[PDB]
Enzyme design. Structure first.
Site, PDB file in Angstrom:
ATOM      1  N   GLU A  78      34.721-108.548  15.801  1.00  0.00           N
ATOM      2  CA  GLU A  78      33.391-108.069  15.382  1.00  0.00           C
ATOM      3  C   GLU A  78      32.389-109.073  15.907  1.00  0.00           C
ATOM      4  OE1 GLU A  78      31.897-108.896  11.476  1.00  0.00           O
ATOM      5  OE2 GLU A  78      31.595-106.675  10.930  1.00  0.00           O
ATOM      6  N   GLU A 169      21.477-104.923   9.372  1.00  0.00           N
ATOM      7  CA  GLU A 169      22.514-105.127   8.351  1.00  0.00           C
ATOM      8  C   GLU A 169      21.871-105.869   7.190  1.00  0.00           C
ATOM      9  OE1 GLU A 169      26.107-107.189   9.561  1.00  0.00           O
ATOM     10  OE2 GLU A 169      26.950-106.957   7.592  1.00  0.00           O
TER      11      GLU A 169
END
Length: 183
Positions: A78, A169
């Site tokens: 990620e 996010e």
């Protein structure tokens, strides 16, 4: 922009709006969130192609990023190229890999291992890579290739990409954002 992928991880934690062919989205979480969301637009398969964005980003009281965000399938990773953020620098807790210079700023680079955590394969073990911009900004061009080539010296597979998006996010606190991707 050639957007063909919509990122929506827990967009219902706030007010996520998008238009793929415009390359626009917005995310309001002004009442705050207690858990993570990741929302944005981009491409089914990532590459080293540069990404050009512009945003309104108001996250000063929030554990939040405005970032290029994506995965490598395998070895599973990620990754983030954090352009602006709120009250949390991932490189404060994580393993430092030094710095890289791109698009007018130093970036702090760091890595972390996530063991049996939510992933694009259910729950799994993966590596995180982060570039965090020292001079934060809400518009510009990310030369993704400079981050990928730097991370690759520290184990980043730098091939067999999954999706790649411009994302907002947040997992704590309150904020709002509105984003346009041009390239």
């Amino acid at each position: 922009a050639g957007i063909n992928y919509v990122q929506n991880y827990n967009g219902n934690l706030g007010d996520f709006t998008y238009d793929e062919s415009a390359g626009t989205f917005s995310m309001y979480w002004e009442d705050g969130v207690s858990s993570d969301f990741v929302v944005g637009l981009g491409w089914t398969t990532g590459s080293s192609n540069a990404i050009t964005y512009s945003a309104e980003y108001s996250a000063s009281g929030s554990s939040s990023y405005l970032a290029v965000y994506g995965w490598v399938n395998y070895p599973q990773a990620e990754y983030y190229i954090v352009e602006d953020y709120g009250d949390y620098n991932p490189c404060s807790s994580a393993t430092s890999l030094g710095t890289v210079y791109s698009d007018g700023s130093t970036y702090q680079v760091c890595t972390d291992t996530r063991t049996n955590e939510p992933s694009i394969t259910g729950t799994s073990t993966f590596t995180q890579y982060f570039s965090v911009r020292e001079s934060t900004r809400t518009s510009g061009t990310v030369t993704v290739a400079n981050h990928f080539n730097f991370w690759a010296q520290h184990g980043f597979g730098n091939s067999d990409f999954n999706y790649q998006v411009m994302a907002v996010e947040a997992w704590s606190g309150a904020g709002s954002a509105s984003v346009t991707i041009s390239s």
